[PDB]
Amino acid sequence: FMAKQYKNLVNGEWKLSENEITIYAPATGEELGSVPAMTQAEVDAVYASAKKALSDWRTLSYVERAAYLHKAADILVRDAEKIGAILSKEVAKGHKAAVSEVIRTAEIINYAAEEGLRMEGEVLEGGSFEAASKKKIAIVRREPVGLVLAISPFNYPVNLAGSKIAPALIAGNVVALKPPTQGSISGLLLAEAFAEAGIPAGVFNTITGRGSVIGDYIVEHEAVNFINFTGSTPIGEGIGKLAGMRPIMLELGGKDSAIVLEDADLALAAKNIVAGAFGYSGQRSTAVKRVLVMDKVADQLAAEIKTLVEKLSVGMPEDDADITPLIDTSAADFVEGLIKDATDKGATALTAFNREGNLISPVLFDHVTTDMRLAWEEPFGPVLPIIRVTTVEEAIKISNESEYGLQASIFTTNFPKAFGIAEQLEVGTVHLNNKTQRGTDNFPFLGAKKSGAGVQGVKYSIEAMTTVKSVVFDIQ
Amino acid sequence: AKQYKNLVNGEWKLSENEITIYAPATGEELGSVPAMTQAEVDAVYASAKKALSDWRTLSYVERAAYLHKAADILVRDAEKIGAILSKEVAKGHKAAVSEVIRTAEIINYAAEEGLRMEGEVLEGGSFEAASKKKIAIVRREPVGLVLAISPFNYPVNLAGSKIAPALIAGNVVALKPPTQGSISGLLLAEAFAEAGIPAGVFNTITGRGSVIGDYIVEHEAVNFINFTGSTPIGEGIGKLAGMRPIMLELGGKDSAIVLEDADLALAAKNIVAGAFGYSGQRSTAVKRVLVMDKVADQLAAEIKTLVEKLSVGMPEDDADITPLIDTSAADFVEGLIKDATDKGATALTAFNREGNLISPVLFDHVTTDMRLAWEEPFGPVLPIIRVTTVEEAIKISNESEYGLQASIFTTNFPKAFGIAEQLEVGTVHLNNKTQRGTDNFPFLGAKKSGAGVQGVKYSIEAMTTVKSVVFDIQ
Amino acid sequence: AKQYKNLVNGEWKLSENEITIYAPATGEELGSVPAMTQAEVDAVYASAKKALSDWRTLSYVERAAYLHKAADILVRDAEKIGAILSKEVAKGHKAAVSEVIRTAEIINYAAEEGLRMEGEVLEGGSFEAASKKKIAIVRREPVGLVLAISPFNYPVNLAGSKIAPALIAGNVVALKPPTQGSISGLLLAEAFAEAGIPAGVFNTITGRGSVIGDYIVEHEAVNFINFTGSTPIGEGIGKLAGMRPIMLELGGKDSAIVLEDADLALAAKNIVAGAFGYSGQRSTAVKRVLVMDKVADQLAAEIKTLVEKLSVGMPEDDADITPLIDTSAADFVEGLIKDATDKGATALTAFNREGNLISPVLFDHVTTDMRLAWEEPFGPVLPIIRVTTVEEAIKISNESEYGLQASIFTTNFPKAFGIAEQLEVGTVHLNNKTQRGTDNFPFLGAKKSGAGVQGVKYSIEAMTTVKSVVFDIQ
Amino acid sequence: MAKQYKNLVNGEWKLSENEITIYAPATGEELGSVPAMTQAEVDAVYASAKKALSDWRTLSYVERAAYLHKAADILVRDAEKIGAILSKEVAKGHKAAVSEVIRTAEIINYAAEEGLRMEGEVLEGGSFEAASKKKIAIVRREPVGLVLAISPFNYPVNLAGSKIAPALIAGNVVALKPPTQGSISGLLLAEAFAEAGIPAGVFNTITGRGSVIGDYIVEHEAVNFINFTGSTPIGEGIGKLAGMRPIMLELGGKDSAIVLEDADLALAAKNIVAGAFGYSGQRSTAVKRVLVMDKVADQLAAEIKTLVEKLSVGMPEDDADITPLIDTSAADFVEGLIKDATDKGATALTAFNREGNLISPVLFDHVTTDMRLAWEEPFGPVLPIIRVTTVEEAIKISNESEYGLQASIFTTNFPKAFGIAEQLEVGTVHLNNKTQRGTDNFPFLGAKKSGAGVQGVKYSIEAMTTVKSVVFDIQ
């Protein structure tokens, strides 16, 4: 393996900056490469190119824009192993899961291309509202918003770059992608696929750099017409106060509850809970982060979950381990603190805590109470609390007391009751007898409270990054 | 007893001959309705086609206003109309008033659904780059003249459910109620006339089937036929309509599939309410219970108990089981009951008939060689057919030529949804009786149960077409 | 000399007897297609109904992958298929290859449109407060077996435009191409077979109308009939379908209304391209010019100049005007020309006929007592009818039994839209010739021009039904 | 006639310790007072609203619609009573003020019926991946929660009801904050909702001084959505305080009327004058600059000039076309734009006159884009005519504005007019008609600094709802 010096895509050209940021693999410390450390003047060059490209891009037919997206997705499928191998090292994601992330990104790009090209407008009748305006009709068609700034997260630096880029591009918007620093190589590899597909100069560009130099600058810039961001809740809250009146989409944290009723299939509930809670070592916003279980089935459910947590593989990304090293030392320190607080307050550790560097073994706690930090705080690590409840009303109350409202799971055999519970839960999506998940990517993805703003899922993302233009006239 | 008249071009008209209508439960003379000739039908259709141009060019809000006024009049006169409706079709007095109230609800809902219908704007650039400046402006238009044919069992509700969706969209209408039910249809017509519906926009036709039955459907003036009635009549209409669009609500033999894990008391409650409502003279009634062997004995006893509590008597006393529409209908039902007894079915409640008042009959051990397992009785008789597997319940359910609705009683909803996908029916109700309601929901039948989708927005969509205006932006 | 075979249940089969097919322009023997019996049609339908369960239970993604593969094969073989299609229906070589490429585009578009199939969730509380916890989950389902009947004039495009929308939605299909056009239909079928379409999901039928014509439509296995052809055959199909859903694209007599303020050069260009494309053998062709008298002499002169430049000759030479499909078609067009001449119409270009190759005929001073003012010729003849007012143009346009499309040539768009509202047609094109495209736009007729709405999403909607599952939230 | 008005808070009418006296801008007449709420009183309004939300969101749509219909019937009944006071409060013509109340009732009724039949969707997992073919998503609408509606002085009843009714039908609870000049009208609208029997806490009002509760009402954690109409500077401040919460902003405009050589100049002049000078130009949606092709400019300017010379200038009680502006600062700002245009050499076709805050209508010709009047929203009766020689120049000048609410195009070539409309950076283009918000079922939106979000009845309902997805696997 030889570390490479990567370049940003700026107005159809690949550009270095005077300074750069060296990226290391979180699992091994191996140097992977460097990405440019852009200056504010270089961000200005990116946005000037994007605004100059907008007129010719938005005036192309939908089929012409869709052709570029399909070509980019075919190139990603062609290079999925080459890109997935680097994505795996960059964010300590299992090799197979990293290659699957690249394939999922090609699927979302293809799906957005076809969803976006068949968007329709509407014709409204004046006579629906008043008799005197019966000959007046409004011809309402969709239009792009302009320049979209897409900011991807470290945990899905390609998938949640494509989930923003393709819906924005099909609608006729121009895009600047700002990947996270830990994930910027993978983001620039995605950019190479769009460049090789022949995306016109300035239509798609990348920005890489340090938060202290360009962090607020890329968002506050008046060239930006829309900010689409996935990342931490505190950073998300900052973007909301910098966007001003400009539309935004935020995908932030979660503390998804899994409510287990007395009539649940406990073995199946345990399977779905462990798959959801410990995927990518719990470093997912949509992940079962707390089990709210009825007292009478709690001992048997905990035994079923424990059996499965003990069998999860813990190790290196190259080995496709279920639990891989966390993204950085600060993240593992934070998770260890939550583990220590639950232990010191009397929670039962059903599986042992171990920390090898930043590789934390999966910890399952029973008898977790609302005074413990782990009942509320999003860990972004492999630790799952089980909180016992006496009534369904109590589970709803504890679930809704969270500042997060991304998704919830309900495990029961009474679906009419599960729907009644789902109506009361302050979340975007409720999965019945299955783990929480963003997929399938055509379904809406949204969070209530501090989990975000806006509705994603492919068609919803296109609708968010478009506006309408109405032309009104009188028939004679 | 009154001599009723047809609404034709804003005028009330008698014909040379009349048909006297008697109450099926008492034989009380209620009045007479005109026996229209083919020439008088021609004048109804000429009047409607003449009124169509001004009617379709009104705004949606203007058409909605006439419907809201007609619905307000039906609410005002619900007791007065319901009292006559009750007698004309031997429906319980309170149920007849409820029917008029429900009709007013449907009319008001159709008026507001229809006035906000929107068109679409399509892009040529979605299909080919060279046509990126070509757009299509697609707006809805009425089909023209709608012939609405209502049934005896819901002569006001299933007249208004066709009339109001047709009218809001700009169509003109001719209502042909059944002879037994024609007074009720003409009473509904009075509310539209009092509401100020323009002359010729809404009209009525009454007469004998041997004189005008085929004539009204085959007439070139009619652009759409919307009918509710028996399957043999519907089949004839489908042939006579030719290429013209149709809505048909025909026979039903709705199955209620009861699984081993069902709440049997809840299943029995819904099955008896669904099977015996209006003495079983409903297309959406539960007409056969397909029950898994292990719970069949318990379910049969629970159903029997509730059948024994049904009141049997006169419409004026709000009996659950009233006399059937006519002698021919009760002879047919008696014949199906005799066939089942002769073939060995167990009568849990046995056959009793006084005039055309048949007591509710419940049969167990009904087999596929019995007429009652398949034929729609339109009477108060319910067969219970035992099955060994869910696959057998699906197969027997789907072997019917009918497929209006089905019910599934079980605590496993993902499994119930999987069964619902396999059933050749329009709607599947989980842990409830089969029913048309609520009236905003789609209502349709597969195979010989009909054509087209009803329910308010669906009926509006059915009785409209589109007009596309295409041009190139410069 | 090749003996073509039908695709039946995944295998290619001949029949005992065969129909030899000849190139209409040269008499060249192209090969033979099977002469299926009624029993062979039964076997095709049984194989399709058997395949339906496993096909409808596939995911939309899986059904779309087959359609995309079939479309790629059609693109790969466009020259090979186009070459035979050109000979079989005497269509210009380049235009025949273009038909194949357009079919692949429609198939790809249908696969992507149908895979995004959405349902609806309706609220009981929208209609009545007591049912606020009742919801309806409404999902789309295939109708079952679709019989697609393609026309000779678009034997691949109007086979693929029916087949792909039906297949993506989970329907199984039987394609019956016209006898003159069956080799092209079976060549299209090869692409679906090589794509690996499961056995029985897609099948073909070929045979004589006297043996299987009515039989294929009356058969109770068929759940939907999607046909393109002439009005008299379509009228027969509506009756034989009974209550089953249909899509019919029949005759057209599209008017081109030219007002005093029209851009006459643009009107002439569009009128000539639309009227004489494929020798006028198109349902959507401009078939009558209704022009305001003050601009008629100049409009007729500019049309005449462009008509005289059309090439007249053989399909292999990409001539604009090629020989008509058969002798009967050319005799029918000749009779219309003679009637117009005998009634005083002015021949701006002269009639000539060599075999079934009729030179393009333009008539002026055509009146409403001439057959050519009303009857669909399906040949290279265009009448110009002078009018004194826009009201007269609308009246004459609407007096036609046909109503597929119309064109309006004027610089006053708001007035053109007001005229479009009054025309009894499916689509009105402003300042352009009538056309079906783009294939995402709706395509439909009024009066005797058809039944149902075509255009990709509309065709998918027509060949699906809904299944509503209703339950109460607790 | 001056009354002590009260806020509607949790079904009761409350005064505060301090009050704000409201005077008629045209005459100085004392109209009454409105409470000067404290931050703790705002907290009580929001606590009441969140408490009422649970039982309101779980009602059926038909039950919520019945309250809106009853409230609209009450507004029609009291249209003269409310309009008489609204006219004095914001110096709007008496008949125009009554018409505003009637229009509000129309919007409320249309919102009740539009909202009650909104639907959910069912999505197939098999549309995206074969392995999830038995997974389906049942997606239903849900309210966003508590909506803070902030109405503007120029439409204090119409653009209060335009936010309240769409929010309520969807199951949201509402707090209306009228502008201080327009708070009596806002509280009169609240009386109709209260008499209609709207449950306690479902609909509430807030009145007070900007220096006591201005930022507080927006920054409050209880508020889940802010729906505002008003000035661009205030709207931009709301964007800073909303954080992650969804907003709708209806801000300023500088609508262009593009007049081509083939236009019907009499039709263009009539529409331009009706739109520009309605309510003395104090409307965001109003023709605020004429971009005319030079060949027809002398004729168009003469036709506009004759119509402007006929507009009545006077008091709201006399239904004058031009009434006194809302306040002295507003009139001073308008006079400044007029003076800049005069000093830079524009031709004053109609004479400038100012008596108190009543400015006579001023029409300028030969306005060049170095003049402030070419760009700045006056909110007063002044209109510039800017001559251009090409359509491309008219499009460039039109789009150079920071505003993008609406535009008008006057021409007989509609295919060309549609091609121009595609290039204009606005929410709506009206062909051969003045810009206007109506009909209220149509979308109403502005690009650039004119706003955020899409209004019009169905659009406002969609904006103030979210979705709840329930995903399960068929077996």
Residue numbers in the entry:
A (entry chain D): 0 to 475
B (entry chain A), C (entry chain B): 2 to 475
D (entry chain C): 1 to 475
Please share excerpts from the published article on this structure.
GapN catalyzes the irreversible oxidation of glyceraldehyde 3-phosphate (G3P) to 3-phosphoglycerate (3-PG) while reducing NADP+ to NADPH. As S. pyogenes lacks the oxidative part of the pentose phosphate pathway, GapN appears to be the major NADPH source for the bacterium. The GapN-monomer from S. pyogenes, like its counterparts from other organisms can be subdivided into three domains. The monomers assemble into a tetramer displaying D2 symmetry which is formed by two interlacing dimers with dimer-dimer contacts primarily mediated by the protruding domain, while contacts within each dimer are formed by a β-sheet of the protruding domain interacting with a β-sheet of the catalytic α/β domain via salt bridges as well as α-helices (residues 232–251) of the Rossmannoid fold of each chain.
The structure revealed a covalent modification of the enzyme at the active site residue C284, which could be modeled as β-mercaptoethanol although this compound was not present during purification. Hence, the enzyme must have been modified following heterologous expression in E. coli. To eliminate this modification and generate a true apo-state of the enzyme, the C284S variant was generated and crystallized. Its crystal structure was also determined by molecular replacement, with a tetramer of the wild-type protein as search model. Due to its higher resolution, the structure of the C284S mutant is presented and discussed here. Starting at the N-terminus, residues 2–118, 145–252, and 450–464 form the cofactor binding domain containing a Rossmannoid fold (residues 145–252, cyan with the remainder of the domain in blue) which harbors five β-strands and three α-helices and mediates binding to NADP. The two other domains are the protruding domain composed of residues 119–144 and 464–475 (magenta), which is critical for oligomerization, and the catalytic α/β domain encompassing residues 253–445 (yellow). The catalytically active cysteine, which is responsible for the nucleophilic attack on the carbonyl carbon of G3P, is located at position 284, in close proximity to E250, the other key catalytic residue. In all chains of the wild-type and C284S variant a cis-peptide was observed while only half of the chains in the reference structure from S. mutans were modeled in the cis configuration. As this peptide bond is within 11.2 Å of the active site, it might be relevant for the proper function of the enzyme.
